[PDB]
């Protein structure tokens, strides 16, 4: 059953992807937007539409619909432009990772081109890079010298120049087992580093809470300047604290200088004695914090499910397919397996395959998430 | 009551201060606000200052263009606007709210109101 | 802007997102004058809504009205809404 399941269910999966993934990734490609900060969405944009108009020739091939010229063309051109793309795709995720790690974890780290990283150059030269110094084997692959081969059938291992393609596949893999364990450190550091923010906002509005309640339960003019002292100087602390966080909470930076502010004038109002008076000022406080965390659970939504997007797009599309790949490379040196057992880790293969070539159509979560600019055009349009 | 003075007509660019005299009551226990009108328009939030703490508010659209001083000397707050730009043109109101912390209330006194035209 | 004659309820209604206790303030605006802040006058809530209530109009009472959007004090940042112009029904 091994030449009728996979245009059952391999190319009948495929058909009902490329009528949809390509038509959903295709709306980012106008980029009215962003010049030196976007980019790489814009470039993974690219390499995905590249990916699902190269996808049709594999259901063409692979259900047995076309001849063996188009097998040869699937074989020669067809994967290859496919696997580059994905390729640079995960690359240009890690890309996009880097950033993320380096904008909101440490302060600076220079480049040629603006002060994270030199956006424009490493767009041109990982494209580059991929397209041919990373797979030659573009016009390299001019068959086996021959063709005729199997007539229709094996109209993919005809190769001639040693095949270096299985050095050129090997390593495609390899640089993913970096990018992917890259993301084991970009990502998780910038999951500690975001919690402790968070951490440290909670316990200083905590604080505030504590000390707001004592004004509203003191006596004396102690009293109210030891809290307002208290709840003065933990503003002070989530202001700064606030800046360490997440991008999409920037107002945050914009709104403490309010609210510390109000805690300055009661606190005139506990020093000059008044603290009858004092304590009403300081109601007003209970009136910002409740305009506070009406906003902080409002946005550590909005920041949980962006920073954990990406991490979710590049763990299911591209990590499984490589999960899949080692068993079947392991078997194909280790022919000891059943042939029945190769077969089902082909199909397998190739469902991981259309599992990683979804990220064409899961592409467009993390344009919508991520890019402001993305969800303006979108409420405009 | 409050009483402002010191609007005309300035060109862009150019720098004015709105006196806003207070009487009635002393401005060091007090918040007094600026609220501006544009022609035809609603009312528009500019600047606050409590002279008792210092604390200084501003609108997002003027913060740094503007800057609110007080004198409880000359029982006066002061709003001097640099940078103004063809769309500051509009009548100011000076506001002051019961409370210097309003308590819920709100800008509860009023002035006059001037008007500032910035064209050239 | 809306129309009603003297004698009639009426409710201007302010939108707001926010869930605070209806701290809102209501200002009457009549034309060619500084703005005054707001016993026919009766404030109410409705989720997000924010209801100014004219239980009988008057002719003074044909101005324009301007909320102060909640989040309108940490003892300052004062967004009033855009208006709603009272006017006479002919």
């Known amino acids: 059953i091994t030449q009728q399941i996979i245009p059952v269910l391999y190319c009948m999966v495929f058909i009902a992807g490329i009528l949809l993934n390509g038509v959903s990734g295709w709306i980012f490609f106008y980029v009215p937007s962003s010049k030196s900060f976007i980019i790489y969405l814009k470039n993974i944009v690219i390499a995905d539409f590249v990916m699902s108009l190269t996808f049709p020739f594999k259901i063409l091939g692979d259900s047995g619909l076309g001849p063996w010229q188009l097998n040869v063309f699937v074989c020669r051109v067809s994967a290859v432009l496919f696997y580059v793309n994905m390729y640079v795709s995960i690359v240009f995720f890690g890309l996009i990772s880097f950033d993320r790690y380096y904008k909101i974890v440490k302060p600076l780290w220079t480049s040629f081109i603006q002060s994270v990283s030199y956006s424009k150059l490493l767009s041109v030269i990982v494209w580059m890079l991929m397209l041919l110094l990373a797979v030659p084997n573009i016009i390299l692959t001019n068959q086996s010298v021959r063709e005729v081969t199997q007539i229709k059938c094996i109209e993919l291992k005809s190769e001639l120049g040693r095949k270096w393609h299985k050095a050129s596949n090997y390593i495609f893999v390899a640089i993913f087992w970096i990018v992917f364990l890259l993301l084991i450190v970009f990502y998780t550091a910038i999951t500690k580093k975001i919690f402790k923010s968070h951490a440290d906002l909670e316990d200083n509005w905590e604080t505030l809470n504590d000390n707001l309640k004592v004004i509203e339960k003191a006596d004396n003019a102690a009293q109210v300047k030891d809290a307002l002292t208290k709840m003065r100087a933990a503003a002070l602390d989530a202001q700064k604290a606030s800046g360490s966080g997440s991008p999409e909470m920037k107002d945050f930076r914009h709104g403490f200088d309010i609210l510390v502010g109000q805690i300055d004038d009661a606190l005139k109002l506990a020093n000059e004695g008044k603290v009858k008076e004092a304590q009403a000022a300081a109601e007003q406080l209970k009136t910002t914090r409740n305009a506070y965390i009406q906003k902080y659970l409002s946005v550590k939504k909005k920041s949980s499910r962006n920073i954990f997007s990406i991490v979710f797009v590049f763990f299911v599309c591209f990590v499984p397919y490589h999960i899949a790949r080692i068993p079947y490379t392991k078997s194909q040196t280790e022919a000891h397996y059943s042939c029945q057992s190769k077969e089902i880790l082909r199909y397998m293969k190739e469902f991981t395959l259309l599992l990683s070539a979804a990220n064409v159509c899961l592409d467009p979560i993390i344009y919508f998430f991520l890019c402001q600019p993305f969800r303006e055009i979108l409420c405009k349009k | 009551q409050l009483v402002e003075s010191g609007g005309g007509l300035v060109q862009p660019g150019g720098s004015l201060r709105l006196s806003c005299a207070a009487s009635?009551?002393?401005?060091?226990?007090?918040?007094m606000h600026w609220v501006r009108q544009a022609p035809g328009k609603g009312l528009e939030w500019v600047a606050s200052?409590?002279?008792?703490?210092?604390?200084?508010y501003y609108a997002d659209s003027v913060k740094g263009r503007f800057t609110i001083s007080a004198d409880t000397s000359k029982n006066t707050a002061y709003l001097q606007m640099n940078s103004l730009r063809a769309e500051d043109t509009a009548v100011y109101y000076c506001?002051?709210?019961?409370?210097?912390?309003?308590?819920?209330?709100?800008?509860?006194?009023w002035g006059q109101g001037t008007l500032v035209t910035v064209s050239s | 802007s809306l129309s009603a004659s003297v004698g009639d309820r009426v409710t201007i209604t302010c939108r707001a997102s926010?869930?605070?206790?209806?701290?809102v303030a209501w200002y009457q605006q009549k034309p060619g004058k500084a703005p005054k802040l707001l016993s026919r006058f009766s404030g109410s809530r409705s989720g997000t809504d924010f209801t100014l209530t004219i239980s009988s109009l008057q002719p003074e009472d044909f101005a324009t009205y301007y909320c102060?959007?909640?989040?309108?004090?940490?003892?300052?940042?004062?967004?009033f809404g855009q208006g709603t112009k009272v006017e006479i029904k002919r």
């Open positions: 102060q959007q909640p989040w309108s004090w940490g003892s300052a940042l004062i967004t």
């Open positions: 009635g009551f002393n401005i060091y226990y007090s918040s």
């Open positions: 926010q869930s605070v206790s209806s701290a």
């Open positions: 200052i409590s002279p008792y703490s210092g604390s200084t």
């Open positions: 506001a002051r709210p019961w409370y210097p912390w309003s308590y819920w209330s709100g800008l509860d006194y």
